[PDB]
């Protein structure tokens with residue numbers, strides 16, 4: 001059957017530290033097991049863009065595979081798998097793949113996000129026929145695909161046209177990070193270009209968000225910095241479309257006929273649209289946003305939805321004030337730049353919150369989160385495991401030596417309810433000498449909390 | 451179901467070239483797919499000793515996983531998987547894993563051989579409680595395990611005591627290379643120390659085999675060379691036991707109760723016991739023998755069995771006169787040594803024969819075989835794809851750069867009966883920069899024959 005070992009079922013999607021108090025951390029050494037993420041079989045062949053979700057009863061995973069250089073965007077296939085957590089005599093769990101689906105039909109599916117659903121996985125993709133710049137330049141969104149893969153080997157794929165898409169968007173793609181299934185709703189992260197002359201475009205004009213780091217502020221007048229912040233949403237690279245984050249929401253009951261819906265947040269509460277991830281921990285929803293724009297720090301929002309079933313659903317998000325480490329970027333978009341400017345940059349590194357931020361009682365200043373960063377302000381290099389507080393890093397554990405190239409990282413933590421052990425899996429694209437561009441490595445460590 | 455794509459089912463375990471004529475070869479570039487061989491999840495974690503068998507309807511694979519240094523032997527686990535060949539839109543087949551079994555119970559199972567059996571896999575292991583030298587030093591063999599893993603998730607393990615083992619052997623271990631299922635018989639390669647002064651030890655005394663390379667002869671008297679060759683079977687490293695190759699044969703009908711049997715070849719026809727592989731091509735059995743002893747060249751025998759009701763079973767083998775390339779070795783056991791000496795050396799690299807040697811009409815001097823070698827006479831380094839004739843190499847396709855460390859290689863070829871394509875999979879242990887000693891890489895190549 002498709003179900004995790006019982007010791008983990010109650011330790012998944014929970015806040016591991018409910019203390020609200022201060023803690024110290026130690027990141028254990030990598031635990032060896034068979035990797036559930038397949039590598040490339042050729043030296044020049046590409047495998048990239050991981051998406052992972054650990055659900056209560058099982059996990060889903062996917063990434064993109066290309067028989068040529070990563071610079072070759074003509075053709076690709078999609079590796080999808082689903083499995084369970086199993087305890088080993090080695091003393092720690094292992095990810096056991098129950099079902100594999102390799103999609104190679106000649107259809108080019110890109111930027112795919114995966115989600116754990118009852119008895120299987122759901123994947124949100126778009127079909128890539130052209131360059132991303134050509135995409136943003138056009139007036140017509142690419143083909144959006146929703147596929148359901150079940151443990152009984154049934155696989156069903158549909159083209160979708162969510163409410164709010166037609167006419168309002170130049171392009172839309174999935175945000176690569178996992179989505180979730182909650183309250184009979186399938187919710188995926190998404191982003192894309194918005195036509196400034198459309199209804200949404202004119203409604204969302206004047207909307208902007210300008211984060212300020214109290215310990216590292218940007219010098220300038222409020223109005224000018226605000227104008228620059230507003231102008232940062234319209235990169236000329238993307239043909240000055242309004243680059244916007246959105247959520248694809250689909251009714252699971254109607255999931256076969258539904259065509260879903262597009263829920264767009266106010267840009268007063270969020271930065272320029274980018275790749276992201278949707279999390280459900282306890283009963284509360286959070287949203288990670290990659291920092292593609294000028295803001296170098298880690299973007300995590302507490303989000304909540306209002307569902308109207310009449311095509312007018314809203315989303316509200318509250319930014320969690322995190323300034324600790326910085327993501328690598330190029331030019332004036334690098335990790336050292338705290339000031340508003342038009343930027344297409346950054347890298348995908350999502351965190352895992354170990355603590356709630358806002359609770360019924362109040363706000364937790366002792367908020368902690370863990371993940372894998374890249375140690376540099378410029379280059380994607382030196383992958384490093386970390387636990388971080390709001391203003392600073394609690395602990396660091398580099399993987400490999402200096403000069404090791406790495407790109408995307410996605411982290412998930414869970415607890416063994418048997419022995420109370422806390423495990424974190426850090427999935428990262430790492431540069432390998434013998435395989436192709438990026439062996440995607442699921443490193444599993446035990447986390448010590450005092 | 452557990453069954454290969456129909457285009458491969460009649461192209462497996464066949465002689466690809468029945469021509470008996472001369473041919474030229476070209477080795478294609480590696481074809482990218484998701485690797486069906488899992489890597490280590492830690493930089494120091496060990497994954498070694500691959501065993502692979504492609505059967506008509508499906509394939510079986512296994513390797514050893516250690517949570518510690520490869521040199522540290524206390525605990526290990528065994529990754530086992532079974533799957534099918536599936537064509538992809540990329541234009542080539544891919545290995546799709548259907549069933550996975552990770553044996554981690556704390557039992558230390560090593561040197562495991564796998565075999566494709568009806569609706570599953572069979573694995574032959576021994577339990578390692580001590581050093582190999584202590585093993586050969588002892589008067590009693592370690593525990594022999596036979597485990598059956600089926601697609602229906604049934605797993606059954608037994609301790610076996612084959613007829614002829616007790617009292618005749620210091621130790622016995624599986625030969626690491628895949629075994630086969632043929633004519634209701636389960637056959638595994640094996641090797642180990644034989645007690646001198648035992649029944650078998652006394653009967654097999656005075657038995658020796660001395661291959662001679664006509665193009666690189668060893669100077670000396672025949673009697674002295676014969677005495678040295680005879681003495682090469684008794685390395686002091688193994689406490690002067692007679693190191694002997696054997697075959698584990700088990701009746702499949704009785705496979706639950708059988709206790710099997712041990713069939714030992716005359717040492718007049720074979721070199722010092724070592725790791726090996728049993729192949730069934732057409733209706734003819736072949737045996738690869740690793741060159742652990744003084745003879746540096748590739749050892750492949752044509753073999754045939756005579757079965758009897760009560761332990762009187764025998765085996766006859768004929769050495770295929772191959773001298774082309776050489777395996778790396780240390781000291782006086784290196785690739786440059788053609789002369790008889792007591793040697794424990796070499797490395798496991800098995801060939802896949804593309805042509806029959808002896809047939810009903812006569813003997814084929816145009817014999818060709820393919821595989822992966824290590825280009826050096828001393829160090830295990832520079833993995834290289836090759837096609838070879840009897841006396842010389844036909845073609846060479848290096849994998850990776852110079853100085854790349856590699857150890858074990860196992861090669862299997864099959865034909866696509868749809869488009870006539872010939873595919874070779876070269877499975878080799880390669881040194882990875884980010885993963886523990888030896889990422890085991892299944893390289894798939896299209897072979898061009900003219």
Ligand SMILES: *[C@@H]1O[C@H](CO)[C@@H](O)[C@H](O)[C@H]1NC(C)=O
Nearest residue numbers: 118119120150151152153154
């Ligand atoms: C597979 O599962 C889905 C939902 O779990 C179900 O609706 C579908 O009918 C199943 N497919 C088959 C062939 O039974």
Ligand SMILES: *[C@@H]1O[C@H](CO)[C@@H](O)[C@H](O)[C@H]1NC(C)=O
Nearest residue numbers: 206207208265266267268269
């Ligand atoms: C966003 O802020 C602007 C002022 O900066 C305000 O005019 C607008 O109403 C706000 N929109 C939302 C949805 O909060």
Ligand SMILES: *[C@@H]1O[C@H](CO)[C@@H](O)[C@H](O)[C@H]1NC(C)=O
Nearest residue numbers: 268269304315316317318319
């Ligand atoms: C929406 O989030 C904002 C923070 O950005 C918060 O101040 C506000 O209370 C939320 N709105 C509602 C209706 O809860």
Ligand SMILES: *[C@@H]1O[C@H](CO)[C@@H](O)[C@H](O)[C@H]1NC(C)=O
Nearest residue numbers: 325373375376382384393396
């Ligand atoms: C980055 O590397 C340097 C060593 O070169 C180290 O001192 C520093 O702490 C690292 N920074 C992070 C965030 O890991």
Ligand SMILES: *[C@@H]1O[C@H](CO)[C@@H](O)[C@H](O)[C@H]1NC(C)=O
Nearest residue numbers: 568569570600601602603604
């Ligand atoms: C699984 O398959 C094997 C194949 O012979 C069979 O002997 C065994 O009884 C099967 N087990 C179950 C539970 O069906």
Ligand SMILES: *[C@@H]1O[C@H](CO)[C@@H](O)[C@H](O)[C@H]1NC(C)=O
Nearest residue numbers: 655656657658716717718719
């Ligand atoms: C093996 O060869 C030796 C001579 O070297 C001979 O005396 C012995 O009888 C042979 N044994 C067999 C089984 O052929």
Ligand SMILES: *[C@@H]1O[C@H](CO)[C@@H](O)[C@H](O)[C@H]1NC(C)=O
Nearest residue numbers: 718719754765766767768769
């Ligand atoms: C056994 O093999 C040898 C070649 O090594 C051959 O000369 C001999 O005739 C064979 N004997 C039988 C019974 O096949």
Ligand SMILES: *[C@@H]1O[C@H](CO)[C@@H](O)[C@H](O)[C@H]1NC(C)=O
Nearest residue numbers: 775823825826834843846852
């Ligand atoms: C080994 O490498 C050398 C060059 O370093 C090359 O010339 C030679 O042909 C190679 N030998 C084999 C057997 O591949």
